[PDB]
Structure 1
Amino acid sequence: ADNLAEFHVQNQECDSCHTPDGELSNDSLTYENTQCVSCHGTLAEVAETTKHEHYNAHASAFPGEVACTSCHSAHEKSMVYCDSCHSFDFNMPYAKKWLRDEPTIAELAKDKSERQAALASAPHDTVDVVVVGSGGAGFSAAISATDSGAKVILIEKEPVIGGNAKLAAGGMNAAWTDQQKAKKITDSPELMFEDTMKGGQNINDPALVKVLSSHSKDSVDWMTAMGADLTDVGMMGGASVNRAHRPTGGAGVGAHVVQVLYDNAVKRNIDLRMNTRGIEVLKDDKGTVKGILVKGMYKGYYWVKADAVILATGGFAKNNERVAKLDPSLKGFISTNQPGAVGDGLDVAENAGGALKDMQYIQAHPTLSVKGGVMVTEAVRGNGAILVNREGKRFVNEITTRDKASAAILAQTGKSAYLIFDDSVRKSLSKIDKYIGLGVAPTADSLVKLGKMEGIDGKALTETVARYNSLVSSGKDTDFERPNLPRALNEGNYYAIEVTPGVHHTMGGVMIDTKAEVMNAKKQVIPGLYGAGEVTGGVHGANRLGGNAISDIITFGRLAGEEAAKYS
């Protein structure tokens, strides 16, 4: 058989998968996936028949209900969604090699005749608010506009929810929380503001940082009121005190928060459509939003009539060509992002008249696993790990800013470095057991053997750790002046992870005011158009602090949702 449908029609009718009139139920393929599930079992039942020791196509930490048609198309060969970041050994029937080629919003100009036909038809739905993107900002806004009495449609162009927010590990920054107080942490919104400005080089828009800092406690209480666990409070670089909140025992912040938001959306019956891309914000004759034209991967173009459009489409860090244009130094770097984080929501914003700002500031995360090509949380260094070069020495304050840490790493022999830590750090941060499970953290009971394994000078490494621990115990890092030295590296076994920088976050984007209203180049509000999260510029300045993006998405998403509901 050349495809999965042809295979199944050797013993089945067309309607063992399709509805009675045979039309596609919707762009989520609800009815159709349900048929796959009714013969093959749910996603968990199917994982039992495809186990591998260290991985499984049908089991992943992705939140939400992952549709079988996310990877299995019926009438054509398709691609495994895990291959946009890993290379596991899979043998999916009717597979084809992972290759994302999504047209730009500009190349979508060519569909002049379908667009026109769709815009001359009646709107397909008429609601109060349309939310574009199912990352943190997008679900938060959908929920808060709904809890504000507005009817919402939430759309996601990918087949799965969560964007890059489902990958967050380190934590969500917040200050002066009840979680921090119970952890005997002393902080204030003023220290977080101050760490943020300093952190972004005083380029950040101060009114936005003030919203960021002043609403962060509330953003954490909101999430916690909806069911999240954000009681573990750790440190990341450029913070004065520990203020990165995440689940108990240091598990990832991302997948958990996106799972809480999805559950909350679901309880409210929020209309969520997958495989549905926002293409053009529609405006009336007085330049205010009247709706949006969308492109359903399965049922074509159609428009949603609405008073308000919230753009929560995240960044363009996956887009190395745009990234290279703005920063030539990042050309050819690997990236930590999901495959559709390419900037198309920015094009929608501009075409709508929104102006952009800070676009030249692109953050490279300092520690991507060379072996796995995936981000290794900075909470690994925050909970105590050190960085050593191939000569087995420390070479940088490990909890310095991302810019500095990336530069020191690229300057080392081989252009990479090694995270080094023990079982006390491991046990303090459960996330580390994910990297051990990926095969990216070799271990040994002595630094002498660990260094032999990885090409690190063994005796040098042993004396480096011994010096570090003595620096921990005396309380001052007089070598590199790391300001927080939480743990001696002396328990149980040792572990090394080889790390190198990757494109990670774009601090510039659509220009928003304090109510998340998109403005033009004159700084005039575009009525009905809002912007929230990494698609916006001005929050993070020239350099974002680890932990500040999940705080930003919850805060600015919530608020845009509320403001869009009021506006109407």
Structure 2
Amino acid sequence: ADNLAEFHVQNQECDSCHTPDGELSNDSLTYENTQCVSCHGTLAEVAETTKHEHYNAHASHFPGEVACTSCHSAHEKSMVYCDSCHSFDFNMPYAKKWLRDEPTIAELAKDKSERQAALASAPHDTVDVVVVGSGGAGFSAAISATDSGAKVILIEKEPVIGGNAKLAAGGMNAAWTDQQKAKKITDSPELMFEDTMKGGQNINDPALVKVLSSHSKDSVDWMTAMGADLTDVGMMGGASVNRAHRPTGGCGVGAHVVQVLYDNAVKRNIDLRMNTRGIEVLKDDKGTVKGILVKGMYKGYYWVKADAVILATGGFAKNNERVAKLDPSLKGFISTNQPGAVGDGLDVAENAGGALKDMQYIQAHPTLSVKGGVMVTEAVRGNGAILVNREGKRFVNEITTRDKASAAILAQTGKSAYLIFDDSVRKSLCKIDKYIGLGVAPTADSLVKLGKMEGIDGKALTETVARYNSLVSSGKDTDFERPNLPRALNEGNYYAIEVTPGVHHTMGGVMIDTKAEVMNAKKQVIPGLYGAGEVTGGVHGANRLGGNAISDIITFGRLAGEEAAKYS
């Protein structure tokens, strides 16, 4: 058979998958996926049949309930979503090679016919607030607006929830939390504010940073009340004290937070629509929001009538063409991002009259795995790993800010470096076992053997770790002035991960005020239009601190949902 439907129809009727009249149920394909599940089992049940030692197409780190049709289309060959970041050896029936070619908002102007028809029609729904994007900011806005008495529709353009937020590792920054106090950590919102402003080269809007620092404990409390575990508190770069909150043992914060948000949205019966892209914010004759034109992948264009629209669409770090025009030093770099993080939400914001700011400030994460092409968490360094070059020497304070760390790594021989750590570090950070599972953390019982394995000077490496451990013992790094030396690298075996910078986060975006209201170039509020999360500019300035993006998206998403509900 040339496609999945053709295979099935050999001994099944059309209505084995389809509704009675044949119409597709909705853009989430709810009815149709339910039919797949009726015969094949849930995703977890299918996964039992497709195990590999170190990976499983049907059991991944993605949170929520991942629809079968995310990867298996019926009437045409389809792509494995995992192929957008990994190259696992898969044999999905009716597969085709991964290729993302999504039309820009500007290109969709070609749908002049179809869009005019939609807008000429009755609104498909009439609600209070539409939230665009199912990352942490969008789910937070949808939940908060719903709890404030608003009727919400949440849309997501991708087939799966969670955006980049589901990928978050190292943590959510906050001070001064119960969780920190329980771990004998002393902090303050003031110190978080100070670290943040300094970290951003004082480019950040201080009014927005004050919201970030002052609301941070409340946001940790809010997540925790919803069921999140944020009890482990680690160190990230450019921070005065440990304040990156994450689940027990140092497991990934992002999948967890997104799962909690998803479960809470399902509990509230929030209308979530997948494969549904926000295209154009609609405004009335006085320039206030009146709704939004969307494009359903399966059901076509339609509009929703609403008082408020909350853009929670994330960044553009996947779009290297747009990135390179703003910061040429990042041209041709690999990205840490999900395939849809291309900035189409900003185009929607600008078309609605929103001004952008700080667009030139784009962060490279200092440590993408060269072998795996995925982010390796800064928490590996926070929990005690060092960086060495091919000469086997330290060369940077491994917990400095990301601008400085990235530059340092790029300055080394081969424009890459190695994370080096032992089993004490490994055991301290649950997330590290994921890199071992991915195959990107080669190991040996001596540094000489590891060095020979990886092309690092083995004797120099050995002497480097001895010297470093000496500095840990004496309590002062006189070589690179690293201010926190949590662990000696001296238990069990040693690991190396080859790392290099990758494009990671866009600090610029739509201009908002402290109420998450989008403003035009005249600094005038556009009534009914809100922005929250990485889509906004002004929060992070010239360099974002690790841990501060998850803090941002929960704080600003929650605030936006409450403000939108009040606005009405």
CA distance in 2, matches of 1:358, 1:223: 29
Residues 523-543 of structure 1 deviation map (CA, whole Å, 9 limit, x = unaligned) = 000000000000000000000
Return the alpha-carbon distance in structure 1 between the equivalents of residues 58 and 221 of structure 2. Answer: 34
Alpha-carbon offset, residue 49 of structure 1: 1.1
Supply the distance in 2 between the matched residues of 1:390 and 1:73 (Cα, whole angstroms).
46
Give distance in 1, aligned partners of 2:288 and 2:334: 40
CA distance in 1, matches of 2:497, 2:514: 41
Post-superposition offset of 1:414: 1.0
Superposed displacement of residue 52, structure 1: 1.1
Cα distance in 1 between the residues matched to 2:496 and 2:327: 31
Q: Distance in 2 between matches of 1:200 and 1:100?
A: 33
Runs (5+) with no aligned partner, structure 2: none
What SS does structure 2 have at the residue aligned with 1:54? coil
Deviation of 1:296 (Å): 0.2
Post-superposition Cα deviations, 1:46-65, rounded to whole Å, max 9, x if no partner, equal 11111111111111010000
CA distance in 2, matches of 1:69, 1:325: 35
For 1:236-247, what aligned pairs fall within 5 Å after superposition? 236-247=236-247
Classify the secondary structure of the residue corresponding to 1:545. coil
Q: Give the distance between the partners of 2:319 and 2:61, measured in 1 at CA.
A: 24
SS at match of 1:130: strand
Question: Secondary structure, in 3 states, of the residue corresponding to 2:313?
Answer: coil
Shift of 1:66: 0.2
Distance of 1:79 and 1:355 partners within structure 2: 36
2:434 aligned residue: 434
**Deviation by residue 1:404-435 (Cα, 9 ceiling, x = unmatched):** 11111111111100000001000000000000
- Out of 39-48 and 236-245, give the one that drifted further: 39-48
State the Cα deviation string for residues 63-95 of structure 1 (Å, max 9, x = none): 000000000000000100000000001111111
Instruction: Supply the distance in 2 between the matched residues of 1:186 and 1:178 (Cα, whole angstroms).
Output: 10
Distance in 2 separating the partners of 1:457 and 1:422: 18
Q: Hey, what's the Cα distance between the residues in 1 that align with 2:509 and 2:418?
A: 33
1:301 aligned residue: 301
Q: Deviations over 1:520-562 (max 9, x none)?
A: 0000000000000000000000000000000000000000000
Identity across the alignment (%): 99
Name the CA distance, whole Å, in 2 between partners of 1:324 and 1:393: 32
Give the secondary structure class of the aligned counterpart of 1:264.
Answer: helix
Per-residue CA distance 1:344-364 (angstroms, 9 max, x = gap): 000000000000000000000
Distance in 1 of aligned mates of 2:326 and 2:448? 44
Match of 1:380 in 2: 380
State the SS of the aligned residue for 1:64.
coil
The RMSD of aligned alpha carbons is: 0.4
List structure 1 segments (4+ residues) > 6 angstroms apart after TM superposition: none
Q: CA deviation at 1:140?
A: 0.1
User: What is the count of residue pairs matched by the alignment?
Assistant: 568
Following superposition, the deviation at residue 144 of structure 1 comes to 0.1
Distance (whole Å) between structure 2 residues aligned to residue 533 and residue 319 of structure 1: 18
- In the TM superposition, what whole-angstrom CA distance separates every residue of 1:202-256 from its partner, at most 9, and x where no partner exists? 1000000000000000000000000000000000010000000000000010000
1:132-160 CA-partner distances (Å, limit 9, x unpaired) = 00000000000000000000000000000
Map of 2:164 onto structure 1: 164
1:59 partner SS: coil
CA shift at 1:18, angstroms? 0.1
Separation in structure 1 between the aligned mates of residue 394 and residue 520 of structure 2, nearest angstrom: 47
Q: Secondary structure of 1:101's match? A: coil
Cα deviations across residues 294-333 of structure 1 (Å, max 9, x unaligned)?
0000000000000000000000000000000000110000
Residue 400 of structure 1 and its aligned partner are, at CA, apart by 0.7
Partners of 2:518 and 2:364 lie apart in 1 by: 26
1:105-146, Cα deviation, whole Å (9 max, x unpaired): 000000001000000000000000000000000000000000
Deviation per CA, 1:435-479, whole angstroms, max 9, x where unpaired?
Answer: 000000011111111111101111111110000000000000000
SS in 2 for 1:193: helix
Take 2:536 and 2:269, find their aligned partners in 1: how far apart are those partners? 28
Segment drifting more, 372-381 vs 42-51: 42-51
Secondary structure in 2 matching 1:175 = coil
2:26 and 2:20 mapped to 1: Cα distance? 14
Match of 2:140 in 1: 140
State the TM-score, normalized to the length of structure 2.
Answer: 1.00
Q: TM-score, normalised by structure 1?
A: 1.00
